[PDB]
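Section 5: illustrative case.
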């Protein structure tokens, strides 16, 4: 697609709260959280360590729903 997802721009350690420096937008498969949502992800925590280049999936963010 042209559908870009949120991809970790650095290793996001477990339980850290997401900041804008941590999140880039890329056309990756499988599709994860839509890149349009990078605004509303700031301050939410991840529930596991996300390595650099990992697509952020809905189940990795605490309190995220669609």
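Designed sequence:
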């Amino acid at each position: 697609a042209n559908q870009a997802s949120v991809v970790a721009n650095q290793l996001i350690p477990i339980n850290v709260a997401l900041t804008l420096v941590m999140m880039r937008s890329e056309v990756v498969t499988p599709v994860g959280i839509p890149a349009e949502d990078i605004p509303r992800l700031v301050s939410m925590q991840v529930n596991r360590a996300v390595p650099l280049g990992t697509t952020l999936m809905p189940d990795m963010v605490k309190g995220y729903a669609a």
